[PDB]
Design a protein that fits this description.
By secondary structure, the protein is of the alpha+beta class. The protein has one domain: 2-Layer Sandwich (Potassium Channel Kv1.1, Chain A), CATH 3.30.710. It contains five helices and four strands; from the N terminus they run E-E-H-H-E-E-H-H-H. Strands 2-1-4-3 form a four-stranded mixed sheet. Helix 3 packs across helix 4. The chain starts with a strand and ends with a helix. The relative contact order is 0.17. It is classed as transport protein. Keywords: transport protein, ion channel. The assembly is monomeric.
Length: 102
Amino acid sequence: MERVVINISGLRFETQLKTLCQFPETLLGDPKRRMRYFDPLRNEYFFDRNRPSFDAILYYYQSGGRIRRPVNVPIDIFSEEIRFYQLGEEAMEKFREDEGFL
């Protein structure tokens, strides 16, 4: 029901649908977009992508929109993940601000 499983390269994350619906205009937030990654055999979404980054992508949702790159995720890895997950321009501006890039 409410619980969703997101498998990033073998690492399972569990969150609530309501958490992903904090941002409906994103890959994970839009049922039509996330469909592309759904695995009906395991009832989960699968992404062959970087695992350390995903904590920070998930925290954007959980926190209601804050971007905080952990020091162990390289800058250009995280940037690319923002792009891929379709977090959008305001998320990218948060990233710049949080990185001191303004």
